[model samples]
Structures are given as C-alpha cells and as structure tokens.
Target chain A: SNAMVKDRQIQKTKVAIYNAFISLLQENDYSKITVQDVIGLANVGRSTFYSHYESKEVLLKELCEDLFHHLFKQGRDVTFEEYLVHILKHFEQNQDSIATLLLSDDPYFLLRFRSELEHDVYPRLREEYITKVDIPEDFLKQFLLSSFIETLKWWLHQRQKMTVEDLLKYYLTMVER
Target chain B: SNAMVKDRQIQKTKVAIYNAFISLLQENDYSKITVQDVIGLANVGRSTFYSHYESKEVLLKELCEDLFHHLFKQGRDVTFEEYLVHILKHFEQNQDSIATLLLSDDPYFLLRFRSELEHDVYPRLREEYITKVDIPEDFLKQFLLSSFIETLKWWLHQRQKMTVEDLLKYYLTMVER
Candidate 1:
C-alpha cells in the first residue's frame, strides 16, 4: 500500500508539471521557458521539479515517450486501417500539445522522436518485408519511415483538413504508389 | 566606382564570416556558437562583424538565403529530372551547413524554409491541380513539401548513401507513389 501510494504521488506530481509545461508552451516560446516558470505554474517548488525531472527538456522527453507508448498500445488488436484512424484520432485529441511540441525550437525532440520510429520500424521491415520490394533494403526503410513522419507532420499542421478516412485513403495511395 | 568597391568589400567580409561559421559548426554545436566565436574565427573585428550582421543567426540566415539563390539560379534551365538531381547535389554540397542548421535548437530555420515552399506551392496547386486529385488542395501541398524536407534530412544524416542520380530516381518513385 505504501509503494502504491508513493507511485500515485509521483504520477500526480508529474501530471501537474506536464500540465504546467503545456500551458506555458501555449503562452511562451519553449526556448524562453525556464524551470522557475514551470514550477511557478505547477505550484511546485524548485526542488520538487528537479527531483522529478532533471530539466524541462527531460520532462518533455518523458511526455513524448509516453505519447508514443500509448500510440503503440492502442494500435494493438486493430487492423492497420483501424490503427491509422486511431492514430489520427489520437493526434486530434492531443493536437494542442502536439502542435506546441512540434513548433518548439528544440530540434532534438523531433529528431529523437523520428529516430525512435525509424529504428523501431527499420528492423521490422527488414525482417518481414525487405525481399518483397524492389527498393534497396536500407533506402526503403529510410523512405518508409521518413514518409510516415513527414505526412503526419503535414496533416497535423494543416489542421487535419481531411477526415481520418480521407487521410487513410490518401496515405495508402501515396505509399502504395 | 567607390560604391562598387565598398559593396565588394562588404561581400568579402560576409563570406569570411560565413566560412568561419561553417568551419566552427564542424567542431561545435550551433547553439554553443556566439558572435565572438564567429568574429574570432573570421579574423574580423567585433565592430566590423556587427556592422555586417546583427548576430550569428543573421549571418547564417544570409548564408542560407544565398545558398537558396544559387540553387534556383543554377536550376533555371534544368529539366525536372535534372532539377531533382540538382537539388540533391545542392544539398550534398552544403551538407555540413544543412546538418548544422537542422541540428540547431532554432526550429525556425526549417519551419521558415518549409513554409516558404508551402506558401509558394499552395496557390499553384489550388489553381492548377485542385481538380486533378481527390485529396484536398491544402493537404496535397503540405504533403508534397514535407516529404521533400524529411527525405532530404534523412539523406544528409545517412552520409548521402546513394548517389545524387540514385537519389533523384528514388525521389521520383517516392513522389509518383
């Protein structure tokens, strides 16, 4: 019970900090945000902020890691078609946070996020589908992952103009071509 | 004649500063670079550097502007096929600068660059090709530009594994798809 209580406390503190970070992001540039700003908004002290995370960037990193985890988790049991709808829905649900993060000056966030997907997908493609394509294994893997990230980025930035179904149809044609 | 000589002198100084910027980029992260580092490396006085450029960022901005200018100027008479190769070749030639700028904490450089293309291409797509596809015009323009940027990014990071000609062939298949 003690461990469970501590875990809950940790989760609460992290959520507070994350919410504070997101709110500040809406009002201010990421480069201009500081630890003090985060703690001030969260009503947490400097010590608590540092204890839970080493820095603002670390906090954002964990937030993104969690997002990707949820993305994959919800994707299970769904057909790729259904999975993509889920992806769009997930992005729409978190559009504000996603937009803030994407627009932030921290290049590492996107670079890290893209590479995580690339690394994860590269091996899967190599193992399951490499021989089926005419494209070279290395180039194909790079192209596939880059295309996915880039399209997702554009879809988000453009306010998700088309419905998830439309996006899926469009995406299939683009990739299948 | 006096004005022409003065203009040439200013151009020479700016080029020196830019060369210093690229050389320093090879050795240090862009965020860590300062105006002093730039001037010191350029062998220019602080006052001269300040007069020519307000900051290291401004210097880099001008450098990128010039890069893009040359890219377009040389590409004028080129075929679409030759132009794709030309684009890859341009990026390859400026690979170090591109990598450094992209790796920098300022997402604005990439964002600004992408939007420049998007804004230029969006109206054309709407007027010329909106009826050509089922995908919405806004989405198509964003999709096209984002793909180019992301693939360019991957190729640069991967040491340009394929030749420029190969990359052009690969890009055609990608966009065609």
Candidate 2:
C-alpha cells in the first residue's frame, strides 16, 4: 500500500510537471523558462522537481515521451494513415501546446523532440511497414521518416495553415501517384 | 621559380600530412591520434596544419568530400548503375579509412559523411531509378536513401564476411527487381 501510494505520488508529480510545462510554454519560450519557473508553476518543491528531472531539458524529454506514449496507446489499432491524421487532429486541437513543443527556438526542445520522434516513429516503420514490403526497409524508412518529420516541423512552424484532412489527403494522393 | 617552389611546398605538406594520417591510423585508433602527432609526422608547423585544416576531423571531411567529388565527376558520362558500381568500388578500396571515419567518436565526421552519402546516394536512386519509373521522387528518394544509409551503417558495423563484390551484387540484384 505504501509503495502504491509512492507510485501515485510520483505519477502525480510528473503529471504536475507536465501540466506546468504546457501552461508555462503556452506563454513563454522554453529558453526563457527556468527550473524555478517550473517548480513554481508545478506547485512542487525544488527537491521534488530535482528528484524527477536533472534539468528543464530532461523534463521536456519526459514530457515528449509521455505524449507519444499516450498517442500510441490511443491510436494503436488505427491504420498508419488514419493514425497520422488523428495525431494531426489532436495537434490541431492543442495547437498551442504543439507549437510550443515543436516550433520553439530552444535547442533542448528540438533535440528532445527528435529523440522522441525517432523512437516513436522508427520502430513501427521498421517492424510493420518496412519489413513487410519488398523494398529495402532501411532506405525506405529513412526517406519516409525524414520527409515526414520535416513536413511536420514545417507545419508546426507554419502553425497549420491547412486542415488535417486536406493535408493527409494531399500527402496520400501524392504518394499514390 | 618561386611560385613553383611555393606550389611544391604546399603539395608536399598536404601529401605528408595525409601519409602521416594513414600511418598513424594503421598503428592505432583514430581517437588516439592527435593534432600534434599529425604535425610532427608531416614535418609541418602548427600554423600550416591549421591553414590546411580546421582540425584532424576536418582533414577526414576534406578527404571524404574529395573522394565523393572525384566519384561524381567520373560519373558524368556513365550510366547510374555503372556509377553505383564505381562508387561501391571506391568504398571497397578505401573501406578501412571510411569505416574509421564513420565510427569515430567525433560528431562532425559522422554527420558530414551522412550528409554526403544522402546527397550523393539518394538522388541517384530517386531520379535515376525510382523517379524515372514514375515513383514520386520526393517520397521514394527519402525512403530509399534512409534504407541505404542504415544498411551502409550495418555493413560497416558488422564488417560481415561477405566480399565487396558479393555485397554489391546482392544489393543491386535486390533493388533491380
């Protein structure tokens, strides 16, 4: 019971940090945010924050990992094409948070995003898509992921000028040709 | 006469440094070699070495770039498939140096190799192969290049028992279908 209680406390603290990150990033760039800002917004003590993360950058990484895990769990059974659209819709829904996470000038954020993106995207691509197809998986996956990631970055940077449906449709249409 | 002397000096210094690099690399790992060692072996001053290269890593970059440039230039009148074989032959000839550069702990050397490999290898596959067949160059190029680079890395890491000819033949046969 005590371990369960400690687990929930850890979960709650991490969630608090995640929520704090979203709220803080909504208003300011990650570069300008400090550990003190995170702790203050999270309503957790400095020691508690330190116990969970080595730095703000570390917190950002955990945040991305959590977000991708959540998305994967939610969209697990959907087609990749559909799942991509759904993910984009969610980003469109939480455009502010997505923008802050993906579009910021912070090198730490870009580095964290890339690490999570590769981890989340690469394996499924290799396991499901690449391996099943006749094409050489390594080259195919690299090309697809590189372009997909770059396009996503461009969209995030441009703040979703086009609808998710249109973007997905256009992408698939081009690939079909 | 003085101009010729200056040109000869420059050529001698550059060749001496390159020769020293090969000798030192053969004797030990790339990480163990140092700027001082290179200069001492080349009989060149620190200033001359700096003028020639930003660092030892830059020397490796220049070497790779020069190799790629030579390969590309030689391919000007060749078929893409022939060009591919020629490039693979170059890799076979210089496998030791290339492998060392690819795996060295230095970030720049690895990254620059990556960029060149993508630049040189991807377009040939996409435009000369996939694009000519009406596959979308943007998407196909991305997919093919990623796979090629990853496979290249795998080949380097495994240093498999397969001969260069077998490896090239196997890859070409696979993609040719």
Candidate 3:
C-alpha cells in the first residue's frame, strides 16, 4: 500500500513536469527554453527535475515518445488516410506544442521521429506491398514518409489554412495523379 | 581600373569565406558552427568576415543563392525532368556540402530554398497547368514543393541509395499515377 502511494506520487510529478514543458513550448521556442524554465514552471526543485530528466532534450524526447505512442494507439485499425487524419487532428488539438516541436532545431527530436517511422511504420507498408507492387519499396517508403513530415510542417506553419478535409482531398488528388 | 580591382578583391574574399564555410560543414554540423570558427578557418579577422557577410546564415544564403542561379542557368531550355536531374546531379557532385545544408537545423536554409522554389520554379508550373487542371493552385503548389524538398532530403540523408535515373523514374511514375 505504501509503495502504491509512492508510485502515484511519482506519476503525478511526471505529469506536472510534462505539462510545464508543454506550457513553456506555447510561449517560447524549444531552443530558448531551458531546464531552468521548465523546473520553475513545474514548481519542482532543481534536483527533482534532474531526477526525472537529465536535460531539456531528454524531457522533450520523453514527452514526444509518449505522444507518439498515444497517437499510434489511436491510429490503429484505421485506413492509412484515417491514420494520417488522426495524427493531424491530434496536432490541431495541440497546435502550440506541435508547432514548437516541428520547428525545433534539436536533432534528437527528428531522429526520434525518423526512428519511429522506420521501425514502426515503414516496415508494415513494405510488407503489405512488397511482391504486389512494381515500384521500389525503399523509394516508396522514403517518398511517403518525407511527404507526410514535410506537409505536416508546412500545414502547421501555415496555421492550417486548408481544412483537414481539403488537405485530405489534396492528398488524394496527388496520389491519384 | 581601381574600382575593377576592388570588385575582384571583394569576389575573392567571398569565395574564401564560402570555401571556409563548406570546409567547416564537413567537419561539424551547421548548428555547431559559429562565426568565430568560420573566420578562423578562413584566416580572416572578425572585421573582415563582418564586412563580407553579416552573419554565418547570410554567408550561407549568398552561397545557396549563387548555386541556385548557377543551376538555373544550366537548366534553361530543358524539360522539367532534365532540370530536376541537373539539380540532383549538382547535389550528388557536392554531396558533402549539400548533406550539411539539408541536415541543418536553421529553417532559413530551407526557407531560402522554399522561396526560390516559390518565386523561380513553381510559377512556371502553375502557368503551364492552370488552365488544364481542376485542382486549387495553392494545393498543387504545396503538394509539389513539399514532395520535392522532402524527397531531396531523403535522398541526401539516405546516401543517395537510389540513382538519379531511378529517382526520376519514380517521380514520373508518381506524377503519372
């Protein structure tokens, strides 16, 4: 019972730190926000923040990994179009955080995203189409993944000028072309 | 004659700075480089570096702009296929510098590239297809430009696993689809 209580407390502290980071992202670019800013907003002691995360980048990586898992779960059992829409919708719901993340200069952020795409997503696509398609799997994988990331960057930066429906329509037209 | 000599001196200094920047790119990522390092490598004093270029980014912008014009000159009167191939070939030839540029965290590098795409090339595509297409102009523009940039990034980071001819073929297939 005591251990359970300790676990709950730890979970609460983690949540607080993550929330503080997200709030900071809304107000400042990622590179500008330091561990000091995060700990200050989190209202946690410096040692406490250090105990949970070694650096600002690690904290961000943890948050992004959590986000990726959440989206992956939400996207499961959907068509690829629906999966993409779910991802975009998630971003729209959290635009401030997403914008900061996509615009960040940190290599780890993109490295993490790229690893996720390579290991968790691209393989499935290749498996589903390997023998049935004439196009090269590697080329197709790179093409689709790059298009997805780059278009998302453009959309976020442009303030979603096109509605999700319109973006989807545009994507379909391009694919059909 | 005096003015002509001055102009040639300025040109030589510019070339020196550019070469120094490229050499640093091979040794370190763009984000890790600084003005001091650039000037040190170029064997120019800080005042001289400043006189030639406002900042590291400005220096890079000048180099990229010069490269864009060079590619533009070579690609004139060619089909878009040939034009794209020429651009890719140039990148392949200067893989080290191109790799560093594409891998850079500075959005300005990409923004400059995007601006060039917008002003210099996409306009021609729009004029060629506006009457023949039903899609929104903005939609088509975003779609093609993102695909081009994203594909280029993938090609560079992946060490150009796909040959220029193969990538062109894949591009044609996608467009024809």
Candidate 4:
C-alpha cells in the first residue's frame, strides 16, 4: 500500500500536473489562474484532480513545499555557506515558477510561504546565544531569507549570469569573513 | 479657496481614513478589511471618498506613498546608510500598518506595491552609485530591499528583538566588507 501510495504512477501524475501548472504560469500571471486551467493542461480528469489536490492554491503550495524540500536535500548538512549555495542552484533552475510563487502579488502564497520559512529552520537559527556573532537570530534569518528571495528574484528576471560555483563563491566569501 | 483647489478637505478626510485603517489593522488582520468599514469609522462621505480615491487599495497605496515621500524627502539627498536608517526608523513607527499591508492576501495591493518598489526605487539606487563602497549597485540595492522586506516580515511576526541600528550594522558589515 505504501509502495502504491508513493509509486512512480502517482509521482508521474503529480509531476505532470506541476509541469502543466508551470507552463501555464509562464503564459499568464498567477492572479488570472484557475484549477480548470491546470487539469486541462495536464490531461488529467476533474475527479483525479480533486482526489489529489483540495484546490489550486493548495496545489501551488504543495508544489513549492516540494521544491524547497528538494533544495534542502541537495547537499550534505555542512556549513551555512554550502547549504545556501546548494539552494541557490535550485533557484536558478526554476526561476520562473518560483517567481510566480513567491515574488508576485499573490499574497496568500507569500503569506503561507513566509509562515513556513519562519518555523523549523529560521527560528532556531535566530535564537539568542546561537552564535557568537552578536546579531539577533530573527534578524539573521530575515537577512538570509531576504537574500535568498531577491537573489532568486534577479535570476527570474534573467539577470543572474553567474554559474552555481560563481554565485556560491561570491556569497560564501561574503559570509565567511 | 486653497483648500478647495488642492482638495485639502479630501486630504484631511484621507488622513482620517488612514488613522482609522491603522487602528483597525492593529486590532485584526488586514484581509478582514472592507471599504464601508473604513469609511464608516473615518466618518467620510461615500461621494467624498470616490472623488479622492479609486478604491480602498488606491487609498492604502496613496497613504503609504505619502508616508514614503516624506521619509524619502528627509533622506533622499543623504548617504545611503543615512537613508537606510531614516527609512527603518519610519518603518518602526508604523510597523503594525506596514505588516498588515504586506501580509494581507490582496493580490491587487501586493502587486501594485511591489511593482512600485521595483520600478521607482530598486533600479534607480542601482543606477546612481549610492556610496563609494564599490559594491555592485544592482546587487547592493537588491540586498538592501530584500533585507528590509525580510526585516519587516520578521518584525511583524514578533521574531525580531534586536535594535534597528544593530541590524543595519550587521548587514552592512556582512556584505560591505
């Protein structure tokens, strides 16, 4: 049952739906989007769409959450610099969909996304006494998160000319000393 | 005659509307807001409101622009660091309203606000070198704006406890050196 639950069939269906969603986003802004648009593009039936996703927004959120999870898993848990580099590489790859998901005026998506970032990782990173660096944890997290957001924002606008190694070097050098 | 010509009466009415908006935001989330709710609390006539603003979203945008113009005037001619400090201070004063506006799920509002930031401020700061630090204007401007947004987002969630100056110092030191 678990195998069926997580098998290639379900995975393929989800990817097809997500791919359809991304293709549509390139053509239209998020505000003008609808669930029918997604299901139609994916060539999936209406009932199947409902069975997998409660609504379009939930589908979008799940898509983003999955993206973040993938980025977070890209490298061994090491220095913050290395972790960020791995993350930035992923951002460069999906700049368009990520922009629609985060940087756009889609407030519900941003609010929910930021709420998720605030928990688990950012809070612990921002806690007092966590670093001898002597800055507030909240501020540090905000700084890093903001850097991540805008860096990816630039990438979305096609201004990111730096390779993954190039960006990591620039960013981590700034972070190290 | 001056009051009639420049619509000072409308300006006063808008100020009342803004005051009411800030008070209401402090008490509840921004998504719960309505045009009638704002006008009723401000004691402004519907016709007067129509003459002044196209919609509640316009009113909110105008209110923020009014405040930002004031802050911009104070620090526009100064060094980038001075501008940053003054702007942050202004933000600190209206933290509640700013938080509500950004965190609200209104696509129209968020899109307009973000587009203004990108169009009016971010690119210009990138154009004219703000400081002699030799940082890439685009990169630094992106960094500053991202940091500011993230700071406000964190501050609203009660995640930031550090003094504003300290936060600025830490950020500048990290990227500047």
Candidate 5:
C-alpha cells in the first residue's frame, strides 16, 4: 500500500509538471520559458523535475512522442479515414496541451516528428499506393507527410471550423478526385 | 541616348545589389544581414541601395514577388504540369538566389507566399473541381496549397535531384491517383 501510494504520488507530480509546462507554453514564447518557471508553477522540487526530465526540451519531446504514439499506435490495419477521425477527436480532446506544443516555435520537435511519420508510415504507403508515373518513392512520402501535417495545422489554426466529418468529407473528395 | 544609358546603369546597380543580398542570405542569417553589408558587398553607395529599396526585407520581397509572378503569370489556362515544369526549370537555373530564399528562416516571406498560392489558385480550383462529399471549399483550398508548397520545399531542400521532368512525373502521378 505504501509503494502504491508513492507511485500515485509520483504520477501526480509528473502530471502537475506537465500541466505547468503546458500552461507556460501557452502563455509565453517557447524560447522564453525557463525550467525555474516550470518548477515554480508546478510546485515540484528542482531535483524531482530533473529526475523526471533532463530539461524542458526533453519534456516537450516526450510529450510529442506520446502524441505521435497515440495517433499512430493503432498501426496500419485501420483504414485511413478511420484513424484520421480518431486523431481529430483525440486532438480536440487534448488541444490544451498538444496545440501549444504544436503551434510553438520549436523547429527541433517538428523536424523530428515529421520523420517518425515518414519512416513509420511511408513504407506501407509505398507498397499500397499505385503510381502510374515511375518516380522515386521519396516524393510521395514527402508530399503525404507535409500535406497531412499542414492540413492538421490548418484545422487547429482555424480552431476546427470544419467539423471532423466535414474535414473528412473534404479530405476524401480531394484524394478521390 | 543619355537617358537610355542612365537606365542601363540603374539596372546594373540593382542587379549588383540583388547579387550581394542573395550572397549574404546564402551565407548568413536573414536577421543578421544589414543594409551596410549589402552596400559593402554590392560595392554601391548607401544612398543607391536605399534609393532602390527601403530595406533588405523589401529586396527579398521584390525577389519573391518576381518569382511568384514568373510561376503564375500563365494564369491557369495552362496545364498544371506545363507551369510546374516551367517553375522547376526556372528554379534550377536560378537556384543560387531562389533556393536560399525558399530555404531561409524568414517566416514572413513564406507565410505571405503561401497566401498568394491559396488565394490565386483556390478560386479557380473551386469552380473547376467537383467534390461529391459536399464540404466547404476552404478545406480543399488549404489542402492543395499546403501540399503543393510543402512538396516544392522538399524538392528545393533536396537540392532538386529530381529533374523538372522527373518531379513533374511524380506530381502528375500523385494527383492523378
């Protein structure tokens, strides 16, 4: 019972830190946010913060990794629209934390995130999609990743003006054409 | 004859300034580049540089405007592939200037350039393209604009190993699918 209670406490501490960092990110520029600010807001000990994350960069990275895993862990068996709808819903639910990280000015996270989608999804897509023109697979991969990421950014930036169904309808029609 | 000769001299001075700015941009940060640096490298007087443009930002903007005009001046009746090949060829011929601009850290240029593509292309696309799914035109507009721009950036970033013909082939295949 003591171990269980302690584990729950650690979980709560991490949650508090995440919330604090997200709050800071929302209000301040990413470059201006400091670890001191996070700890002050989180009410966690400096040592505890270090134990949890090497730095804010790592914290943001892990947060991003979690998002990527969430969006993609379903793997490729699910149809494209199925997972896309799932992703839109998930983003809507967690936009408070995720949107700030996404909309933030950090290039390191975005460049790295783009690669995961590329390496993980591109191979399967390469095999499944038929291209009449014989071109290198790299172009297709780049186009899909960039288009999808930019489209997702638009949806977020517009505050989700198009409902998930509406967005999906638009997406399907464009590809279908 | 004196007026015509003077006009030629002005053209040469502007060309020198453009060359100098492009060189500085290729070598250094956009933020670090200054008017003095441009004049110094261009071997032109300070007043001459100022006479030509208000600032380096305007210089870059004019260069970009020239590029956009070059890309879109055919005005949509031309086949997409025709102008795309034209764009690729033009960039290849002038990669020293255009590539660095496209690859630079200045979000101002990119964001502005993206709007031109969105507004200029989106309206015509809306009238011609039929979407059975009945979604707002904005999503389609966003999707096409983002995908095309991202794909172009990729091509430029890759040092354009794909020939205009090759890139065109890949593009045609993707959209045709």
Candidate 6:
C-alpha cells in the first residue's frame, strides 16, 4: 500500500510538470522557457521536477509519444478515412495545444509530430495507402504524412472556416486523386 | 570612374558578407552563428557588416528572397515539371547551403522558404495546378507546396539515391495523383 501511494504521488507530479510545460509552451518559445518557470508553475520544487523528469525535452517527447499511442488506439475498426475523421475531431478539440506545437518556430517540435506519425500512423496503414502508390513505401509515407500535417496547419490557420468534414474530404480526395 | 569604382566596392563587400554567412551556415546551427563570425570571415569591419545587412536574420531573409527569385527566373518558358528539373539541378549544385537552410531546427528559416514559394512560385502555377484540385486555390497551393518542400527535404536526406529524374517523376506523379 505504501508503494502504491508513492506510485500515485509520482504520477501526480509528472502530470503537473507535463501540464506546466505544455502551458508554458503555449505562452513562449521553447528556447525562451526554462526549468524554473516550469517548477514555479507546476507548484513543485526543483528537485521534484528533476526527479520526475530529466528535462523539458524529455517531458515534451513523452507527451508526443503518449499522444500518438492514444490517437491510434482510439479507433478499433476504423478505415483510413474514418481514422482521419477521428484525428480531425481530436485535433480540433485540442486546437490550442496542437497549434502551438505545429506552429512552433522550432522545427524540432514539428519533427517530433512527424516522427510520431511515422512510428504510430504509418505502419498500420502501410498496406492500405502504400499499395496504392507506385513509389517506395518509405517515400510515399513521407509524402502522405507531409501533406497530412500541412493540411492540418492550413485548417488551423483558417480557424474552422470549413467544416471538419469538408477539410477531411478535401485532404482525402486530394491525396488519393 | 569614381562612381563606378564605389559601386564595385559596395557590391564586393556585400558579396563577401553573403558568402561568409552561407559558408558558416553549413558548419553550424543558425543560432550558433554570430555577426562577429560573419564579419571575421568576410574580412569586413563590424560597421561595414551592419551597414550592409542589419542582422543575420535579415541577411538570411535576403538570401531566401534572392534564392526563389533566381529559382523562378531560371525557367521562364519551362513547364512546372521542367522547372523542377532545373530546381533539382540548382539545389544539387548548392547542396550544403540549401540543406542547412532546409534542415535547420528553427522553422522560421523554413517558413521563409515556404513564403518565397507562395510569393514567387504559387502565382505562376495557379492555372496549371489549382484548376486540377477542387479545393480553394489558396489551400491547394499550401498543400502542394508543403508536399513539394517535404519531398525536397526527403531527397536531401537520401543524398541522391534516386536520380534527379526519378525523384522528379515520383514527386510530380504523387502530387498530381
């Protein structure tokens, strides 16, 4: 029971730091923010923050990994188009967070997003999408995901000007065309 | 000959600074570079460097502007596909510099590249490419350029594994598909 309590306490601290780092990301550039600001906002001491996470980069990366894990696991029997519909809705719900990450001046953050797509999304849809293209599967996935992420960026900039369905349809048809 | 001599001197110093900056970029991160390094390499005084270009960012922005300007100007009568052939060759010749700009951790640098595409390349091909897609012309250009740039990044990463023709053919067919 003591071990269980300690585990729960660790989880709480990690989540606080994670939330703090994400909120700070929204307010400032990655290079501008520091560990002091994170611990200050998170309401944890410096040691506690460091003890829980080695660095802000580590924290941000964990968030990205958890994100794609949940994103892919959200749909069981979904087709690629349907999975995209789910993705659009999820990102629209987290518009501020996703926008900040996608729109960051640092390509590192955006590259992490692409890395997750390559890891989590590409493998599952390999046969479905890659079989349709004549080029190398690797290149096709790169092209497809590149187009996909940029489409999300355009939609974010447009601020819901088109319905989710409309954005989804446009992307699907344009890519599959 | 006095006025002509002064004009030649001014152009000489500017070229020196530009060449120095581009050379330093290949060796280090954009943030890691400094005006001091640039001036030292250019063999110009601090005042001369600042007088020529206000800051490193401005210098980089000018390079991007001049890059796309020359890139678009290189193929006035060529088709988009043919234009890409020219682009691939041009960038291949200047691989180190272009790769540094494209692969920078700061998205600001890459954004300038995209901005140039929007300004110099998009308007030129509106009728040819946009009419093929049913979406808004603005969105189509954004989508097209995103795919195009990412394809270039991938090509750069692969280091000419595919021939210029093979890469060009794959990108055109993929996008227009």
Best by lDDT: 6
**What is the C-alpha lDDT profile of model 5 across B24-77, one tens digit per residue?**
877766777889989888999988888889877888778777767767755656
Interface RMSD for each of the candidates: 1.9, 6.6, 1.9, 2.5, 2.5, 1.4
RMSD of 4: 6.4
Candidate 3 wrong stretches, greater than 4 Å: A1-11, A47-58, A74-80, A95-99, A119-134, B1-62, B73-75, B95-100, B103-107, B126-134
Q: Score the docking of each candidate (DockQ).
A: 0.47, 0.07, 0.60, 0.46, 0.56, 0.65
CAPRI-style docking class of model 1 based on DockQ: acceptable
Candidate 6 lDDT (Cα, whole model)? 0.76
Tens digits of per-residue lDDT for model 6, B103-130: 6746776776777677666675565555
Candidate 4 local lDDT, B42-100, one digit each (tens)? 88888877776787667666666765566554445676667767656755665536546
lDDT of 1 by residue, B127-148 (tens): 5423546565556666666666
Per-residue lDDT of candidate 5, residues A28-142 (tens digit):
7567788899999999889999999899988777777777787776556777657667767765554546655566647866776677767665555445443433556577567
Error of 2 at B9 (Å): 5.8
Model 6, A14: alpha-carbon shift in Å?
A: 6.1
Using TM-score as the yardstick, the better of models 1 and 2 is 1
Ten-residue region with minimum lDDT total, candidate 5 chain A: A124-133
Instruction: Kindly state the number of residue pairs that clash in model 2.
Output: 9
- Candidate 2 lDDT tens digits, B46-117: 999988878888766666576557765554777776777776665555543655555453466566665776
lDDT tens digits, residue span A1-177, model 6: 999999998998888888888888777877788899998889999988878788878876787777666666564787766776777776776643656677664667777777877866667556554546477777777888888888888787775467778988777667763
lDDT on C-alpha atoms for all candidate structures = 0.68, 0.64, 0.72, 0.63, 0.71, 0.76
Model 5 residue pairs with clashes: none
Best of the candidates, DockQ: 6
Tens-place lDDT per residue, model 3, B1-177, is 999999998888877888989888766777788998888877778887788787877867777777677766453788876777877887766643765676674566677777877876676656653444767766678877777777677777774467887876776565442
- Cα RMSDs of all predictions? 5.3, 6.8, 4.5, 6.4, 4.0, 4.1
- Screening candidate 6 with a backbone cut-off below 3 angstroms (N, C-alpha, C), the clashing residue pairs are A177-B177
